[PDB]
Tab-separated table of C-alpha atoms and ligand atoms in Angstrom:
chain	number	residue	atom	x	y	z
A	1	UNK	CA	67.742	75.850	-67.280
A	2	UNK	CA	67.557	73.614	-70.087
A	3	UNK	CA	65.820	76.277	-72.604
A	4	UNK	CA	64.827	73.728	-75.725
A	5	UNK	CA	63.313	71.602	-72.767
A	6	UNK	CA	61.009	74.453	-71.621
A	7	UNK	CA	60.467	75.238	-75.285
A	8	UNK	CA	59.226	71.590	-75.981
A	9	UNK	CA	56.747	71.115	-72.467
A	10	UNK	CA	55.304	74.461	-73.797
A	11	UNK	CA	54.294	73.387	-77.139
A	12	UNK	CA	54.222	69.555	-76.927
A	13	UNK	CA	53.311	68.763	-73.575
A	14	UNK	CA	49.461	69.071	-72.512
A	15	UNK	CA	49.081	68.163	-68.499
A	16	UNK	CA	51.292	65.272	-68.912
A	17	UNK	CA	51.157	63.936	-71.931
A	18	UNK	CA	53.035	64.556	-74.925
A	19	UNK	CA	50.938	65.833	-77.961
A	20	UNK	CA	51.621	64.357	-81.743
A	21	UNK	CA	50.046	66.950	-84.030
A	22	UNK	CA	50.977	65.678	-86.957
A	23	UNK	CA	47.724	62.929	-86.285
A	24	UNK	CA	44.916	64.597	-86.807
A	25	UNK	CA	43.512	61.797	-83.669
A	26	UNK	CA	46.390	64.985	-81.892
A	27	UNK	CA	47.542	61.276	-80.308
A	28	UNK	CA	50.028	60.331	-77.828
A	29	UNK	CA	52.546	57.492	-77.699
A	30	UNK	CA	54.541	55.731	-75.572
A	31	UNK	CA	57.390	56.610	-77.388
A	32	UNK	CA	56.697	60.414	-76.870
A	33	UNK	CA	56.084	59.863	-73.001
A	34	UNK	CA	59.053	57.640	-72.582
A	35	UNK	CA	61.435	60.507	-74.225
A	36	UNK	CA	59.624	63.436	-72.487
A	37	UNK	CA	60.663	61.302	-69.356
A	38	UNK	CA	64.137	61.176	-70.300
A	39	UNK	CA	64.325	64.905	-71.017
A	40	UNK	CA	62.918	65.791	-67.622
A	41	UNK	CA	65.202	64.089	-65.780
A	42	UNK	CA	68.234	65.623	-67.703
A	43	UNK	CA	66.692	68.695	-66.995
A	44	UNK	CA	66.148	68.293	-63.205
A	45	UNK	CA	62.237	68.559	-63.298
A	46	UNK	CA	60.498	66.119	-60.928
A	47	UNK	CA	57.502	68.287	-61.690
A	48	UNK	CA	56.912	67.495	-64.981
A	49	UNK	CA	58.586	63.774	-64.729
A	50	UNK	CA	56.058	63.141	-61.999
A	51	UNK	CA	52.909	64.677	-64.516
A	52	UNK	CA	53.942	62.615	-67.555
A	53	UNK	CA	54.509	59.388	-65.343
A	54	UNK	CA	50.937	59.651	-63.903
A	55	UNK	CA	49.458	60.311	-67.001
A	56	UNK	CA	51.312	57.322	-68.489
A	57	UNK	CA	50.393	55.167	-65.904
A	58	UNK	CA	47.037	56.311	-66.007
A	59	UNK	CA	45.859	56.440	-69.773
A	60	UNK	CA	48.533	53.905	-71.321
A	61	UNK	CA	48.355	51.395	-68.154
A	62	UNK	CA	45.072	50.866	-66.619
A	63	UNK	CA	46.571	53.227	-63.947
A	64	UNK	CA	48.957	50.043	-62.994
A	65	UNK	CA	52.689	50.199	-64.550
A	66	UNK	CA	53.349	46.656	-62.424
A	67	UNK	CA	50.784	45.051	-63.674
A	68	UNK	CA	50.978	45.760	-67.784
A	69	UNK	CA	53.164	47.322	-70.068
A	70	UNK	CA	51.783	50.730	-71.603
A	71	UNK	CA	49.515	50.904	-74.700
A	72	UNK	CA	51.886	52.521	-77.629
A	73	UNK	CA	49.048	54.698	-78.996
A	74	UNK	CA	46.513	56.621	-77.283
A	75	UNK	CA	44.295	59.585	-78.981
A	76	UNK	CA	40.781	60.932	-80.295
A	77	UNK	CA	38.536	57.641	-81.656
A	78	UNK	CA	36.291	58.216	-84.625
A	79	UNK	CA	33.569	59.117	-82.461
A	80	UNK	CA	35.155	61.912	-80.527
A	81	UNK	CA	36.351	60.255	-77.413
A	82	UNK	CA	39.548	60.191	-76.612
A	83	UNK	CA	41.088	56.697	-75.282
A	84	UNK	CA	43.475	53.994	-76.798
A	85	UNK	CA	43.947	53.456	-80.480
A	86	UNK	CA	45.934	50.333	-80.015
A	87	UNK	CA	46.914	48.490	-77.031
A	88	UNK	CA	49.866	46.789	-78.107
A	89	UNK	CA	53.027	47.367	-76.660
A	90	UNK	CA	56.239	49.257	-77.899
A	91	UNK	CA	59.340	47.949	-76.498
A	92	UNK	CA	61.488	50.374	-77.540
A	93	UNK	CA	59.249	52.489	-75.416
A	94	UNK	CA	59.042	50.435	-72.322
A	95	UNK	CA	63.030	50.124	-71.979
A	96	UNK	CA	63.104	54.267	-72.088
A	97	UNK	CA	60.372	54.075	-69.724
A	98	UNK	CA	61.423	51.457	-67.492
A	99	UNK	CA	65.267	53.179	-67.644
A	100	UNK	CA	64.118	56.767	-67.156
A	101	UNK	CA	62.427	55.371	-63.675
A	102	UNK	CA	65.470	53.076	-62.962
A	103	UNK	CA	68.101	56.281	-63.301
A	104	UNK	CA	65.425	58.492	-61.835
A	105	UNK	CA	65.302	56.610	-58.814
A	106	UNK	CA	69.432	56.248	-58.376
A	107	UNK	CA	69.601	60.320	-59.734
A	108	UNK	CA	66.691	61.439	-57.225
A	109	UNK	CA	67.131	59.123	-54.624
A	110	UNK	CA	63.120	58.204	-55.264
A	111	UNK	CA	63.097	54.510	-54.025
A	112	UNK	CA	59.509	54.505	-55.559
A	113	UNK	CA	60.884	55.037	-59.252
A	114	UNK	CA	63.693	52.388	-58.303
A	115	UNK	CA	61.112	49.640	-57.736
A	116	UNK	CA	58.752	51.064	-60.479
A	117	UNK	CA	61.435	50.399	-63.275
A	118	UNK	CA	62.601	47.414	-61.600
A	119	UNK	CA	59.049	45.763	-62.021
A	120	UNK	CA	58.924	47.505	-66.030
A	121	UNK	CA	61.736	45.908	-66.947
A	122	UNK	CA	60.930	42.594	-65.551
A	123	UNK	CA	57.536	42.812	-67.503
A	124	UNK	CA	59.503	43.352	-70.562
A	125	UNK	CA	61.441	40.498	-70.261
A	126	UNK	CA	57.980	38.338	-69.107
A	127	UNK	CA	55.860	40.003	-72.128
A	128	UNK	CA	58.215	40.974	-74.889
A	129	UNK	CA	61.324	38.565	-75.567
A	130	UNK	CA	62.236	35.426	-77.015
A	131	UNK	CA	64.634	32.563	-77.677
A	132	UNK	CA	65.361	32.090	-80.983
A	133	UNK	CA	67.975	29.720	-82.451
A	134	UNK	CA	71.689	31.225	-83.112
A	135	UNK	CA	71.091	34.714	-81.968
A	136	UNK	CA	69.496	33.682	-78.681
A	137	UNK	CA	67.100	35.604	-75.978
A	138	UNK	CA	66.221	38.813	-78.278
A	139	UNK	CA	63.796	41.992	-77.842
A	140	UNK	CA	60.870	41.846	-79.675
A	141	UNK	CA	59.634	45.155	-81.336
A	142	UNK	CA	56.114	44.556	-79.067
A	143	UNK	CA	54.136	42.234	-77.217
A	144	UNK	CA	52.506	40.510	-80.209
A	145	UNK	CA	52.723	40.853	-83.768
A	146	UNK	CA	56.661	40.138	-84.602
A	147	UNK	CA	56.509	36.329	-84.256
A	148	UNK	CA	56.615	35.275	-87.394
A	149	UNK	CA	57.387	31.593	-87.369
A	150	UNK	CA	59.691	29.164	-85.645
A	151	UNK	CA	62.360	30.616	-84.529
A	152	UNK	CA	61.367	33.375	-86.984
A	153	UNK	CA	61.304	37.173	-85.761
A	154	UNK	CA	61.239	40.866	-87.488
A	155	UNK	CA	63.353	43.167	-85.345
A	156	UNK	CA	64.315	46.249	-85.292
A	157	UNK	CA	67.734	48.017	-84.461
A	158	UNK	CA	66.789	51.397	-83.475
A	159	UNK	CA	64.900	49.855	-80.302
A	160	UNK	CA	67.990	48.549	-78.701
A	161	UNK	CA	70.308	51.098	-77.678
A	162	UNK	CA	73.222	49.022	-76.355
A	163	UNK	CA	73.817	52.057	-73.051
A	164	UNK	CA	70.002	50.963	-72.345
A	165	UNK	CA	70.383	46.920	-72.235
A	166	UNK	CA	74.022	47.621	-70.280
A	167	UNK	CA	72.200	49.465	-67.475
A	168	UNK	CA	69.575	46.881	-67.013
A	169	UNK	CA	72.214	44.380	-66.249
A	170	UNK	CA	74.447	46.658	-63.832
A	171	UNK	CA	72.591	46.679	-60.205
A	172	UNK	CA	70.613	44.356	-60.456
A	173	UNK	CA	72.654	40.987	-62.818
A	174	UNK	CA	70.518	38.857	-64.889
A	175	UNK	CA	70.690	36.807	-67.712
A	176	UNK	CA	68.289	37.429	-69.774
A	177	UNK	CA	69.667	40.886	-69.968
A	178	UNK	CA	72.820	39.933	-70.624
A	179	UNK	CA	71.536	37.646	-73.410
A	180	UNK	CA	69.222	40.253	-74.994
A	181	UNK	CA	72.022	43.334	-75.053
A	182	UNK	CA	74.078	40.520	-77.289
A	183	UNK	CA	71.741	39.161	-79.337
A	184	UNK	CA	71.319	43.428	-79.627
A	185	UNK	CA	75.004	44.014	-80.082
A	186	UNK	CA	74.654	41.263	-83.257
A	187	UNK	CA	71.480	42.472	-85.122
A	188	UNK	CA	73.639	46.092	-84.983
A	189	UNK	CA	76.668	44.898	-86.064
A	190	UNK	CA	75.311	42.333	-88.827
A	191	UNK	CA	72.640	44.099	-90.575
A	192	UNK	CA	74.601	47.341	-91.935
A	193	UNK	CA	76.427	46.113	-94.462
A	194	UNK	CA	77.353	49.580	-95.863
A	195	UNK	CA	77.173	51.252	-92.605
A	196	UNK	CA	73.242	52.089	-92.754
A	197	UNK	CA	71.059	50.402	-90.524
A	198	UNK	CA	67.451	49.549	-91.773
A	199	UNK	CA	64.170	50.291	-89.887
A	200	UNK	CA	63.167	47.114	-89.667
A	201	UNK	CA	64.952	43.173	-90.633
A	202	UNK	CA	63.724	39.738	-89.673
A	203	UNK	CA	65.900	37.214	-88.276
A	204	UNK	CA	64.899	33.463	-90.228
A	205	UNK	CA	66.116	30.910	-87.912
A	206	UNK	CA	70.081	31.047	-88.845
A	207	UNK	CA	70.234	34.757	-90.594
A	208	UNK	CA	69.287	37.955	-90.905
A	209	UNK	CA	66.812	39.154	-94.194
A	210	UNK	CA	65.270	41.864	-95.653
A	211	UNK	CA	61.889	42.694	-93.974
A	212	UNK	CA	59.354	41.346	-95.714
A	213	UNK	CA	57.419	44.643	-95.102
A	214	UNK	CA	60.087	47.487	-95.504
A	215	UNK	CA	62.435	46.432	-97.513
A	216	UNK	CA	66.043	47.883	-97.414
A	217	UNK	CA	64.810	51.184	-95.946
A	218	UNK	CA	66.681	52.892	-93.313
A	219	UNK	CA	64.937	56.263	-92.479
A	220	UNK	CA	63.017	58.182	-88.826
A	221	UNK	CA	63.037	54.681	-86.865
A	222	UNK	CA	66.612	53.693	-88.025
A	223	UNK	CA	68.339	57.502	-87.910
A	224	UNK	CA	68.248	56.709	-84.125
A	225	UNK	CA	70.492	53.734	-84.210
A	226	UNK	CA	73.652	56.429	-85.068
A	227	UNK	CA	72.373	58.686	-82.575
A	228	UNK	CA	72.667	56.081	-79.769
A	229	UNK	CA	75.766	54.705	-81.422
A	230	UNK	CA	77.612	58.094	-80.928
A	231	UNK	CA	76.389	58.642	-77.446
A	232	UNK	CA	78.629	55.415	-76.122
A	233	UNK	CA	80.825	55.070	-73.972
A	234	UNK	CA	84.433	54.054	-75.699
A	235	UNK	CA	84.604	51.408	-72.452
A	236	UNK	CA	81.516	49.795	-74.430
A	237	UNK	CA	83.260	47.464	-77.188
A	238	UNK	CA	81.000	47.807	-79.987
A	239	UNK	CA	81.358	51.087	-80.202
A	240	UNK	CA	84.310	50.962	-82.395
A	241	UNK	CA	82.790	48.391	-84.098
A	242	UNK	CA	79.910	50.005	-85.091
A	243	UNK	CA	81.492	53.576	-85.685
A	244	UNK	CA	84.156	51.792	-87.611
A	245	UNK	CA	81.457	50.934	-90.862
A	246	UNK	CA	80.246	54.491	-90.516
A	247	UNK	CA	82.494	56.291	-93.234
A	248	UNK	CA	79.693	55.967	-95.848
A	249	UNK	CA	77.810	57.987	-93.406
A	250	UNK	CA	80.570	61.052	-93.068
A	251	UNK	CA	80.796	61.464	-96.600
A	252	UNK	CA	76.997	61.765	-96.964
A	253	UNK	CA	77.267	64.614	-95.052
A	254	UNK	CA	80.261	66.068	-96.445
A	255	UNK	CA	77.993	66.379	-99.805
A	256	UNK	CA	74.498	66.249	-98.849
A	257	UNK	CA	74.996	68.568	-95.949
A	258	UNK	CA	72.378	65.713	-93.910
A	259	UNK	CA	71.070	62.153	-93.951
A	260	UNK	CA	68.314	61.435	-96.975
A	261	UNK	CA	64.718	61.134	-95.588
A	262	UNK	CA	65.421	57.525	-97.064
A	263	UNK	CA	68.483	55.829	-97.798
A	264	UNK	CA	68.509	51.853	-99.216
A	265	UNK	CA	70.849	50.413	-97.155
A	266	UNK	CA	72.463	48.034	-99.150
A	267	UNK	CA	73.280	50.289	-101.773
A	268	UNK	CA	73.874	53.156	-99.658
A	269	UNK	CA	71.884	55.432	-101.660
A	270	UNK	CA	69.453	57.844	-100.228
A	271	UNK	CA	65.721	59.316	-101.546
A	272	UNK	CA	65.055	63.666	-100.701
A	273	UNK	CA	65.934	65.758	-98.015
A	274	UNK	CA	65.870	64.276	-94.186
A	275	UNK	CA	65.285	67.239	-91.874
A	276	UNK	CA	66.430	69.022	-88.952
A	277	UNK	CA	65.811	66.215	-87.035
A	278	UNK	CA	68.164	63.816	-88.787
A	279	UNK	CA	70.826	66.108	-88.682
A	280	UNK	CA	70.588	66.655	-84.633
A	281	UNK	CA	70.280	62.909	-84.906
A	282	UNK	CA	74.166	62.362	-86.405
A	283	UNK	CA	75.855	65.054	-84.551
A	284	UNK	CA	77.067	63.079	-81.607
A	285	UNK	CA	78.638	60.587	-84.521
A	286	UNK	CA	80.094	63.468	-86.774
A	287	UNK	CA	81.624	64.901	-83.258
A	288	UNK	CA	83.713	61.617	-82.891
A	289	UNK	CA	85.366	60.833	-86.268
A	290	UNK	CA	87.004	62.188	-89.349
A	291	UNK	CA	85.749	64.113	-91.744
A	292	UNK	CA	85.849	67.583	-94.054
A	293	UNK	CA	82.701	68.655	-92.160
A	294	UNK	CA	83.193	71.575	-89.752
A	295	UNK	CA	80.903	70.140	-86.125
A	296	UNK	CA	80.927	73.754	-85.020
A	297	UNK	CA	79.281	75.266	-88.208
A	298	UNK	CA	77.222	72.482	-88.656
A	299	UNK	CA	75.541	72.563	-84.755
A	300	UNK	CA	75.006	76.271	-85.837
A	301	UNK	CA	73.222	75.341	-88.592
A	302	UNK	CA	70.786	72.797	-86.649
A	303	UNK	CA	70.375	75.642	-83.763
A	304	UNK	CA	69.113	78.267	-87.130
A	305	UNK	CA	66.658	75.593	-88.105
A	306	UNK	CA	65.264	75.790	-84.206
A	307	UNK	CA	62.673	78.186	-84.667
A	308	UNK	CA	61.006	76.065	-87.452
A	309	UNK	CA	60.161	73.418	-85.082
A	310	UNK	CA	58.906	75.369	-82.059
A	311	UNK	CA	55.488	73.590	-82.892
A	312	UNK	CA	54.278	71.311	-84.750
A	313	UNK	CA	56.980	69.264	-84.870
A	314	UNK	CA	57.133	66.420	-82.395
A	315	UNK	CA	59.773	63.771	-83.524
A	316	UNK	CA	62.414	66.524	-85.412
A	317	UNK	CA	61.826	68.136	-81.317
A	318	UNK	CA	62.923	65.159	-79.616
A	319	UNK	CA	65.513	64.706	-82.270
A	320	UNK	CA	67.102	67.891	-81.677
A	321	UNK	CA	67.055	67.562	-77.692
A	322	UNK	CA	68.970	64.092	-77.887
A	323	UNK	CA	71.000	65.219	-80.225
A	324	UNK	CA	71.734	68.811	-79.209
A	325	UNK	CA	71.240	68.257	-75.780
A	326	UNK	CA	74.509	65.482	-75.893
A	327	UNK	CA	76.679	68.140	-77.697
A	328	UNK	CA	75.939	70.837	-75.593
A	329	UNK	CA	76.763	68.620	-72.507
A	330	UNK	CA	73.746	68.392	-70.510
A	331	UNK	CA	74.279	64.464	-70.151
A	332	UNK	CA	76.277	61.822	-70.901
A	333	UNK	CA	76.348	58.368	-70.936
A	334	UNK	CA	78.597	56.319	-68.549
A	335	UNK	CA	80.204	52.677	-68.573
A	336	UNK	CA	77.610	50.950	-66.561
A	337	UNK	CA	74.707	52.261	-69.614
A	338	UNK	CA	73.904	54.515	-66.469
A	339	UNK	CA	73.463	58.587	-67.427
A	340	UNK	CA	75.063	61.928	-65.702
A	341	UNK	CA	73.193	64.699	-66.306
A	342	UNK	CA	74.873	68.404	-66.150
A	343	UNK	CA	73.297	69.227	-63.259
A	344	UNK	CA	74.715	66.232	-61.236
A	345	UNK	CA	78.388	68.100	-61.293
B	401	CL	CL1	75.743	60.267	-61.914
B	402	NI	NI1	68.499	52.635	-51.087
């Protein structure tokens, strides 16, 4: 039904687990499993949602999702096993994987997946935030390692997509939720000062700074952040805040024909050629404002480039089914952060 779906489980997805090539360890994230979980549920497939959530629970887990968040990166050691590489956590991860369950569970009437997310996202909020000073309860990029002093933190704005920390707040009210999706709604707003968000940025106790680590770079982590950006909801109000410092962005692709693999984002200029994936990546943003750009030639272009990235390809794949898959209507995104897939109605 959902053809770039069946395309992707048949050349990414090995008995539940999503393959990363590209490594020659042929790893697995959480990251990968968390989108693949996504993309089954748009498509309808309790099958394969039911494979990759066993194997995630199982590999990633310690076979227990209640009891720990999953290990980001999983894969063949140096002696030939296979097993985890690292055992940190990846938040961004754990919200997709704790949100897939929760809208899973309301989609599919699966009261298992209900209390499944429920008990994810309560981890995340036990194992992976904080209260810092002035921007208050955030989401840290992973269970250690992004501490950096007192009230000291490196973020990043790609993790937080705003229809993500809405829905965790909508059945079930909390606080801390509603803290964390505006402490998110600031480091979005406050850290693209030409319109470009970076991959990574720090918060220092009373404003934001460059990342110590990656500089002014905005590149795969940070495309993301315009991808979830133009899959709002208008009812959410940053929306139009956000899209409103995006013009830089249109005219990039009014001459570049697609994002740079890097741009600097305080200058707003960019470094080579980005990829198919970028360019799936921007098309729900170029579908809802102004430019010289024609949407329908340019989704023609991205569905030409398809073939390319049959295999081999992991992150330009997932790219392209967010992107794609939005445009084409197979789901959208509703006022509650909750999603409606095509087959719903
Ligand atoms: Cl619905
Ligand atoms: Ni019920």
């Amino acid at each position: 039904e959902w053809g770039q779906w069946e395309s992707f489980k048949q050349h990414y997805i090995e008995n539940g687990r999503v393959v990363d090539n590209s490594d020659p360890r042929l790893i697995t994230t959480s990251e990968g499993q968390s989108y693949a979980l996504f993309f089954a549920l748009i498509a309808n497939d309790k099958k394969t949602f039911d494979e990759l959530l066993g194997w995630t629970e199982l590999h990633l887990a310690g076979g227990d999702l209640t009891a720990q968040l999953p290990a980001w990166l999983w894969g063949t050691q140096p002696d030939g096993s296979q097993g985890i590489l690292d055992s940190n956590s990846a938040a961004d991860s754990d919200l997709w994987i704790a949100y897939s369950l929760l809208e899973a569970g309301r989609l599919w009437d699966n009261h298992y997946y209900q209390s499944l997310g429920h008990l994810l996202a309560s981890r995340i909020l036990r194992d992976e935030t904080i209260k810092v000073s002035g921007l208050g309860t955030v989401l840290l990029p992973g269970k250690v390692g992004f501490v950096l002093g007192k009230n000291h933190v490196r973020l990043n704005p790609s993790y937080v997509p705003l229809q993500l920390l809405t829905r965790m707040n909508t059945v079930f009210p909390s606080y801390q939720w509603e803290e964390i999706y505006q402490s998110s709604a600031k480091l979005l707003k406050e850290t693209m000062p030409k319109g470009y968000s970076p991959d990574w940025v720090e918060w220092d106790k009373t404003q934001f700074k460059k990342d110590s680590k990656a500089q002014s770079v905005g590149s795969y982590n940070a495309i993301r952040v315009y991808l979830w950006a133009g899959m709002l909801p208008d009812s959410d109000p940053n929306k139009a805040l956000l899209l409103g410092k995006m013009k830089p962005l249109l005219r990039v692709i009014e001459r570049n024909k697609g994002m740079p693999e890097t741009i600097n984002v305080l200058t707003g200029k960019g470094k080579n050629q980005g990829g198919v994936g970028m360019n799936a990546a921007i098309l729900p943003l170029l579908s809802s404002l102004d430019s010289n750009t024609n949407v329908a030639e340019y989704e023609k272009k991205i569905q030409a480039e398809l073939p390319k990235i049959e295999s081999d390809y992991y992150y330009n794949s997932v790219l392209t089914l967010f992107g794609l898959g939005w445009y084409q209507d197979l789901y959208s995104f509703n006022d509650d952060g909750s999603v409606t897939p095509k087959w719903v109605n």
